[PDB]
Amino acid sequence: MPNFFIDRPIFAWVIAIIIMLAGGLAILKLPVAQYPTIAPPAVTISASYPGADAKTVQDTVTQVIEQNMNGIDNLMYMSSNSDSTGTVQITLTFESGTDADIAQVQVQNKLQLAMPLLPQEVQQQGVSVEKSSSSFLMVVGVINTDGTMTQEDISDYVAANMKDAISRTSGVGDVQLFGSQYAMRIWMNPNELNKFQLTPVDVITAIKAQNAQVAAGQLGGTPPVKGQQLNASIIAQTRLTSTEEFGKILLKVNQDGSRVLLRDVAKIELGGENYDIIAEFNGQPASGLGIKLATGANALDTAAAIRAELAKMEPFFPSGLKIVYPYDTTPFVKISIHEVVKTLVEAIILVFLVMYLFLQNFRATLIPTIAVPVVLLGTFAVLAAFGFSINTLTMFGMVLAIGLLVDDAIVVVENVERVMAEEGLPPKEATRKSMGQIQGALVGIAMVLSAVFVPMAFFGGSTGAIYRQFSITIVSAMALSVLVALILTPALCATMLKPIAKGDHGEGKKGFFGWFNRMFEKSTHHYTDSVGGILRSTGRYLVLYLIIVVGMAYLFVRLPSSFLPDEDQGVFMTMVQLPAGATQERTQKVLNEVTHYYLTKEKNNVESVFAFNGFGFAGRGQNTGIAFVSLKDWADRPGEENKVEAITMRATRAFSQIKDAMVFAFNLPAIVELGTATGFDFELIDQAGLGHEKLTQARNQLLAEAAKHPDMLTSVRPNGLEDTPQFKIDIDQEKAQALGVSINDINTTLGAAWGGSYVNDFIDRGRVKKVYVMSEAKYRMLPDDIGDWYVRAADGQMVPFSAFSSSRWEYGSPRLERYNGLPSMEILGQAAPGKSTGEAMELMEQLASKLPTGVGYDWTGMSYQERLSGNQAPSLYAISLIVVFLCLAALYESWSIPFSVMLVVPLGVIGALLAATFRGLTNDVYFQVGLLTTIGLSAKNAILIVEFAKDLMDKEGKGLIEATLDAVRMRLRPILMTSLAFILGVMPLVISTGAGSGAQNAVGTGVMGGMVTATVLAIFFVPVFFVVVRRRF
């Protein structure tokens, strides 16, 4: 096939041109993202049951729903929780790769079995199932610049005029509203109601009759009488619109003709729907949107559309409104992609400089260079066909390939150059002779290098998703490289190589060239003399091989394990928790302290602080808070002391002095779709019916012991609220019937006054908004306030609420969690600095072993993937070695040769482990790629010797010692040139220190150590192994 294109040079360029432009068009259409879809899909269920406590809700709603959820396809684990507000959340996580839409249908199909069994209050409220994620894509904040309008005014304008428009765009999956739409609030005064002999029941009935909308028939009608000439619609009572109209509602007319109106026994005010969430931005009132992208949508494209949309409606804002972006992750994605591209263009320059160093003229060193753009652009076309997307993982694939694919053209160009010097053959004739003796060598390298990366792509789990990106890039690049080297290089090099004098070695060359050649050639002569004494006796060097194998085993078991590393994304979060029973005001005081510290001590780094009150993780409550912190640009934060890890370490050590509060700060996880914070995630699960109180004692015992080892465990904290007192009133219906008071009136009066009620809806500028009834704030703050209310009896007299009721105090947990249908409690924390998450996970299993009988443990979220990843690691290596062994056996018809090559692999692995230990890295997902790559390139060096000696053996009849020496003497030059090119190729990755450099360091360091020993040591042991195996057979 190569001989076909030597006589057809113009045809050869056509293939290269077509591939080059095909990749270019694919670049203009491929999507861009930081990572592929590696998170497993999740489906959530929401429900409500107002008025019920946490314990009642779990046994009546949560337990029933989860009982019927067994038997779904590809179910990983299920978790749920309930709280005192009556809300229920059940989340199911499916295996990675499962279609979300099919799973969402399946869970909805099964849920309908248990729907009628739920209380009718739950059915009327309504339940829903939908896909969900645990993190926001971005947060858009709205503030008022002049402070002319309050907090709820900001929220309503966004809710009524902004929120619906955003969701009408593509990519958006769900939007969270930090506030509430307007709603007509009526604050009753219990003293005024008692004076006019009225009850909240009378107010409720009056509103429902004075604020309704009814229909009526058409005046013309159908069927019509003969000759009717008109047709019109009758209009009747309609809904009210303004607060001035609500003041006209008539409650009761006195016997003397006096009238009492709703304006006279209550304050009519337009306000919010819920007051349990208070937001603040840099100490100013604000409201905002929590927007999360839909499953399968592009992150960058969605963000670009959102920013465009806000520009559309911005000019129509009322004076004093502006948009703020306190939380965003897209700038990190933009920077990370740009950094790697800069790294890639730096690596290709380094490779070119190495090529020119070996005495080569300018015209010669070009020949292998044109292959680089072709294979890279050709790789992009393959990605487009299969539907992949450009990402950081695919970025690393070709970066490793740049220093690994050039050798295909190097062998051809170097060998024909040697033929020119040794024989003085004409260029066209010499090229027609060179490819005959290297054709098997070329296909061998590509076929071996593709062998390691093929079996890795079939593994499942989130780890398998990472693996597929590397395999598709390396294999496609390798297949293209052998093609382009065989199809293009011999044709172009056939005529490009100008005549060269026979025997010329560049003795009089200028510069370093005049000295470099003499030293290299002299070193080559010395090397063969050194090798000659090696074959004299193999006993000594065989012993040294054993000590290396033992040495690498010792290093392997000492390396700590971990999952994907974390990067300074420019944003981190702070969590605040207070003791049980803390009011909203007390929490606000602490949040002022935490927001005052950042803007005074860390003013050089932080930019803005977005604080929430009431909302937060581990359930909603008045004693919980959260704050988002956004840092400045990376270019304005020099050094390491101004990074996220350094800042958050100093913050926690300073907030520990806050009395009567728990404050922590932490970085976001590696991927924000599984967990809310970095580090492990530990679940303590009861599995023997111990009971809630006994389970709590075990949890306290475990974390108390964990506090005894601060040097490996830090920031250990529960993820649930503590026990709180409850105030329950006992109603005596026996006395109620004696006095003549309806039970419904008592229940309605208590519920409406203290908890509020929803009555009707009214029209506000064309919208539809709720109407609520509540007692005034200063009448429902103390237990003694119940003595002020009254209820009307059938006789017409007032009776105090204390005449037939009594109260007492109780205790009860405000939140309960369940794991896989069993009661459980969550524990969170972080590893100590200098340690690894693997060490922390190992330590806790030892601590959990001393727990009382009947309680177990299980990992979830972030930790679950790490446990799964480490279990399947041994299987990955075993399969790869078997495929390589069989692959080599096809290429040479002998079992002996693969044994010789295989024994070189340990010499390559020891290099990676030694490099990792010096840099203090951890055996993680990226390290797995390095070891697999180390297998391929270690065997690549051994191939260039064993194949050349074999041909010189059976085709020339040379002796075994003679054949081994000849191959080493002639193949020394290509080995050094290729290995040096690869080493300088990954130079930028190791030395990189910019944004997102943690991931680059892990990939580069592991492979870097492998090459060094795979060249220095293998160039000695390969002759030994080849002789020993051949002698045995």
Author numbering: 1 to 1033
From the paper:
Resistance nodulation and cell division (RND) efflux pumps are secondary active antiporters that are ubiquitous across all domains of life. As part of tripartite multidrug efflux systems in Gram-negative bacteria, they span the entire cell envelope and export a broad variety of structurally and chemically unrelated toxic substrates. During drug efflux, AcrB undergoes a functional rotation where each of the three protomers sequentially cycles through the conformational states loose (L), tight (T) and open (O). Substrates can enter the PD through several channels and bind to the access pocket (AP) in the L state and the deep binding pocket (DBP) in the T state.
To elucidate the conformation of AcrB without the crystallisation bias, we assessed the structure of the variants by cryo-EM. In contrast, V612F and V612W mainly showed particles in the T state (72.7 % and 83.9 %, respectively), with these variants displaying trimers predominantly in the TTO (54.9 % V612F, 44.1 % V612W) and TTT (31.8 % V612F, 53.8 % V612W) states. For V612F in SP-ND we found that all three states, L, T and O, were present, indicating that DDM binding is responsible for the absence of the L state in the detergent-solubilised samples. The T state remains, however, the most abundant state for V612F (53.1% T state in V612F in SP-ND vs 21.3% in the wildtype). Thus, the introduced substitution clearly shifts the equilibrium between the L and T states in favour of the T state. Moreover, the proximity of the bulky aromatic side chains in the hydrophobic cluster might introduce a steric hindrance for the rearrangements associated with the closing of the DBP required for the O and L state formations. Indeed, our structural models of the best resolved O monomer densities show that the DBP remains partially open in V612F/W structure. We assume that the O state conformation is still feasible due to compensating interactions, such as the PC1 and PC2 subdomain proximity, and PN1 subdomain interaction with the neighbouring protomer. Thus, the stabilisation of the T state DBP in its open form and impaired DBP closing are likely the reason behind the observed increased abundance of the T state on the expense of the L state in the V612F variant.
